[PDB]
Design an enzyme around this catalytic site. Sequence first.
Site, PDB file in Angstrom:
ATOM      1  N   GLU A 356       0.578  -1.414   0.143  1.00  0.00           N
ATOM      2  CA  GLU A 356      -0.428   0.164  -0.332  1.00  0.00           C
ATOM      3  C   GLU A 356       0.930   1.204  -0.084  1.00  0.00           C
ATOM      4  OE1 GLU A 356      -3.547  -0.025  -0.148  1.00  0.00           O
ATOM      5  OE2 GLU A 356      -3.642  -2.235  -0.099  1.00  0.00           O
ATOM      6  N   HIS A 486     -15.992  -8.374 -17.817  1.00  0.00           N
ATOM      7  CA  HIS A 486     -16.634  -6.234 -19.263  1.00  0.00           C
ATOM      8  C   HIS A 486     -17.432  -6.624 -18.928  1.00  0.00           C
ATOM      9  CE1 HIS A 486     -11.806  -7.354 -18.323  1.00  0.00           C
ATOM     10  NE2 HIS A 486     -11.415  -6.729 -19.857  1.00  0.00           N
TER      11      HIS A 486
END
Lengths: 595, 96
Positions: A356, A486
Site C-alpha cells: 500500500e 467486462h
Amino acid sequence: STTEEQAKTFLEKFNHEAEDLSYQSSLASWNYNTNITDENVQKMNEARAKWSAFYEEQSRMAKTYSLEEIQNLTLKRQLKALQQSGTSVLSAEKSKRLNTILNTMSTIYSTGKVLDPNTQECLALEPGLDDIMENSRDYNRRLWAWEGWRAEVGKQLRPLYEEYVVLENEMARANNYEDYGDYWRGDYEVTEAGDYDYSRDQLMKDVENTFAEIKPLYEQLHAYVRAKLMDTYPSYISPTGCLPAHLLGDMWGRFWTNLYSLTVPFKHKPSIDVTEKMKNQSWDAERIFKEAEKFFVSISLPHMTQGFWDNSMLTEPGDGRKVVCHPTAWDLGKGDFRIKMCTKVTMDDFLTAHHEMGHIQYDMAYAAQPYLLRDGANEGFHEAVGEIMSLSAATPHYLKALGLLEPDFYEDNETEINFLLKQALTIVGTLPFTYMLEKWRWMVFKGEIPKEQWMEKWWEMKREIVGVVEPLPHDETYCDPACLFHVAEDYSFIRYYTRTIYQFQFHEALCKTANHEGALFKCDISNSTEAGQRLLQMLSLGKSEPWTLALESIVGIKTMDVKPLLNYFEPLFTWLKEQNRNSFVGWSTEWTPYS
Amino acid sequence: SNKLDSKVSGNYNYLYRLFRKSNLKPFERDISTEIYQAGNKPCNGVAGFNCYFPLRSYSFRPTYGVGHQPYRVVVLSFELLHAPATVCGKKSTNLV
Ligand SMILES: *[C@@H]1O[C@H](CO)[C@@H](O[C@@H]2O[C@H](CO)[C@@H](O[C@@H]3O[C@H](CO)[C@@H](O)[C@H](O)[C@@H]3O)[C@H](O)[C@H]2NC(C)=O)[C@H](O)[C@H]1NC(C)=O
Ligand SMILES: *[C@@H]1O[C@H](CO)[C@@H](O[C@@H]2O[C@H](CO)[C@@H](O)[C@H](O)[C@H]2NC(C)=O)[C@H](O)[C@H]1NC(C)=O
Ligand SMILES: *[C@@H]1O[C@H](CO)[C@@H](O)[C@H](O)[C@H]1NC(C)=O
Ligand SMILES: *[C@@H]1O[C@H](CO)[C@@H](O)[C@H](O)[C@H]1NC(C)=O
Ligand SMILES: *[C@@H]1O[C@H](CO)[C@@H](O)[C@H](O)[C@H]1NC(C)=O
Ligand SMILES: [Zn+2]
C-alpha cells in the site's frame, strides 16, 4: 511568425489550472469516503461535474492542433496524448442510450437471487448469498448456490449485453476509427522513433509463447488438484474428462484455499504458524508502515515522516460515523500523502501494508513530471514494484534478520515449496480465464462472427484452454455467458494479465543486476544500494519517453521473454513431476458425462 | 512561513507573472496591465484564442508539500559609492 509559441503558451496555461482542479476534484472523493454524509455528496458530485465541463473547453482547443511544426519529440509525445478524441466527437443523442445500459447493469448484478425450494422453515435474513457458496461442502448445497448464482443472475444481464454491443458497432463509424479493437491494442503504441518503435503486431507472437510454454506447468496444476480430490470426492470427479463447475468454489475460481485442508501438500508436518507469539507482544499498528520505510532507506534515499503522518488514521473509526477502509492510496496532489486502510496485525496484511505505502514511493519520484505525462510507464508496473519486495520481506528467512522468526528454527525446504505453490496457483488461476476473454473480444469487433454465436463461441474457447463445463446443458433462454467481467462490472483487466509477466521481469531484473546468487525464488535486496540507483533510473523517468527505452536500460531487452520463468520454480517443478510419474498429465475436453 | 502565510480555503492574493514579451533587465519591475497576444488578431475583452492572462495565483494552502509552502525571501544588496560610508557595523571594552 513561428507557430510554436502558440503551442508553448497553451501547454503551460492548461496544466496550471488542471492540477489545481485535479487536487480539488480528488479531495472531494477522498473526504467523502473518510466522511460519508449527504452534504459531502453535493461537494463530491459537483466537483466531478464542474471539472469535466471546463476540461472539455480546454481539451477541445487542445486537440484543435496536432503534431505539426513541433521539432521537439518530447513535446510531440505530450501533445499526442492530449489529442485523443474518445467521446469528444461523440454526439449527445447516442450518448444517452449508453447511460441506460451502464447505470442499471451495475446495480442489478450485486443483488444475487437464489430460489430456496421447498420453503425450508421460518427464515431470518441469514444466511447470506456470498457466504452460502463459500462454506458449502455438501454437493446439493454447492450446486443449489451455484445454479441460482448462474441462471437467476444471468437472466437480468441478457437484455443489456446486446444493446451495449450494438452501440459499440455504431459509434465506431462516427468517431473516425474503424473499431474498438484497435483502441485497446494501441495503448502501447510508439510513433516516430527511428530504430526504436514498437508495433501492435508484435504482441500477438510474444503472447503465443507465454501460454504455450506455461501450459505444461498448468496441466500439472490441473492434474494435481484432480488427483488429490479424486480420493476425497471420486463420485463428483471425472477421471477421464473435465471437472464440474460447482467444484471451483465460486464464480471466479481464483481462490483454491477454501478446501485447502482436504488438499494439503504436506500433512505430515503440522501447520506452520509461529506468528502467534508476536501477537501477544503488543506491537503498535503503525510500525508496519515504518518496516517498509526503513527497508526503503537502505537504497540510500532520505526519510519521509514530517507532515505526512497526520492526515491518516489507524485501528480506529474515531466516531459513531462509519468509514469505509478499502485500500485506496493516492497522493491527492502537490505532494499530499494519504492512505486509507484498516491496518491490522496480520502476516498476510504485513506484505499488504508494504504494497500500500510502496505505491506512494512510486508516486513521489514522478510527481515532478508535467500534468500530461505524470504516471508510470505501463499499467502493471505500479503494483509489481510493491509486491516484489513485500514478498521478499515476508519470507521467513528475512524474519531471522528482523528477529521475528524463532531462534531454534531449523532449515526447512518442505515449507518453502508449499508457499510458492499457493502463490503460483492464484496467479495462474485466471490467466487462461482472461486469455479466452481478451482474444475472443478482438475478433468480435472484426465482424466475421454474427450475433447467434454469443453462446457457443464463448464456451468453446474456454473449454479448449481452461476446461470448464456446466453439468446440465442450458438453452438460449438461460443466460450463462453474461457473467463476463467486462460487461458485469466493466473493469479493465489489462492491468492484471500483462502485470504478471512484468512481475517476473521486474523480479528477475533486480536480482541479476544486483550480483545475486543462489535460489531464484528467494532474493535479498535489503542492505544494497546498487539496485535503488538503477531503480530511480525509471522510477522517475515517467512517461516523457516510451517505456521501450527504460526496458533496455535496466536489463537490455526490448521484447517480452518467458524463458526465465522455468528456472523460478525448479525445486517446485521436481515435486510435481515425481508425484505424477504414473498418471497421464492431461485431460479430454470432448468427453462429457452426458455422452 | 507556512504557518502564517497559508489559508485553508486558499491565499489567492499572491500573484506571479507567467508570460511576457522578452527577458527582463536586472532590477526592473513589470506592473503593466496588458493581455498577452499571439498574432494581434484577438482584441481586448474577447480572449478565446491565443490570448491568456499571464498573472496566475500561487494559491497557498496548509495541506501542501514542503516545496509548495510559501517561503518569504529578503534580499540585501550592498553599494559602495563616492559617499563617506554612512552605514557601518563596533565593540568597545571597559577602560582601565
Ligand atoms: C544491514 O547491515 C547492518 C550492518 O551490518 C545491520 O545492522 C546490524 O545487524 C546486526 C545483525 O542483526 C546487529 O547485531 C549485531 O551482530 C553482531 C554480529 O555478531 C554483533 O557483534 C553485535 O554485537 C550485534 O549484536 C547489529 O546490532 C546491527 N547494527 C550494527 C550497527 O551493526 C542490519 O541489521 C542489516 N539489515 C538488514 C535488513 O539486513
Ligand atoms: C463530516 O462532514 C460534515 C459536513 O457534511 C461535517 O459537518 C460540518 O462540520 C463543520 C465543521 O466541523 C461545521 O462547521 C458544519 O456546521 C457541519 N455541518 C455541515 C452541514 O456542514 C462533519 O463534522 C464531518 N465529520 C467530522 C467527523 O468532522
Ligand atoms: C525539447 O524540449 C525539452 C523540454 O523537456 C528541452 O529540454 C529540449 O532542450 C528541447 N529540445 C529541442 C531540440 O528543442
Ligand atoms: C505469547 O505466547 C507464547 C506462546 O503462545 C508464550 O511465550 C506466552 O504465552 C506469550 N509470550 C510472552 C507473554 O512473552
Ligand atoms: C532445500 O532447502 C534446504 C535448506 O537448508 C537445503 O537442504 C537445500 O537447499 C534444499 N534441499 C533439496 C532441494 O533437496
Ligand atoms: Zn495496490
